[PDB]
Amino acid sequence: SGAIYVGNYRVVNRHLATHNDWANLVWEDSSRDLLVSSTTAQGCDTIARCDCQTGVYYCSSRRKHYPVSFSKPSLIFVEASEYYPARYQSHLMLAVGHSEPGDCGGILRCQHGVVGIVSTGGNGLVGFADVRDLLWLDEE
Ligand SMILES: [Zn+2]
């Protein structure tokens, strides 16, 4: 589990979104496994605005933050998980590392802020849903 709290936005994995998220929906995209809902309280996370390919992610199933290199956001074929069938997922970045279903929502961060959240795992790879292209998170 986990979210990003920027401005009056909460960014979560679409497959973990709550009723309250859908009841306060701003934007969602199944192909990216993302959903954004509106918040009453201001959040304090900063979204990275960059093309970094190195950063650190939180892996809840190891209670550890791991430094990783990660790929550029792309359309990646992902094997079946407990929460999606095998499919293409868009705006996804891969690293070599551990990720199990409960790790979804863990933050990937670089020097500029939050890059994205864990979304995929298996075959010794971790996949992160990029948020750096969602420039509207910075405003309004
Ligand atoms: Zn960066």
Swiss-Prot record:
The active site is at H15, D33, C104. Zn(2+) 1 binds at C50, C52, C110, H112. It catalyses: Selective cleavage of Tyr-|-Gly bond in the picornavirus polyprotein. Cysteine protease that cleaves viral polyprotein and specific host proteins. It is responsible for the autocatalytic cleavage between the P1 and P2 regions, which is the first cleavage occurring in the polyprotein. Also cleaves the host translation initiation factor EIF4G1, in order to shut down the capped cellular mRNA translation. Inhibits the host nucleus-cytoplasm protein and RNA trafficking by cleaving host members of the nuclear pores. Counteracts stress granule formation probably by antagonizing its assembly or promoting its dissassembly. Homodimer. This is Protease 2A. The lineage of its organism: Viruses, Riboviria, Orthornavirae, Pisuviricota, Pisoniviricetes. The chain holds residues 869 to 1008 of 2193 of the full protein.
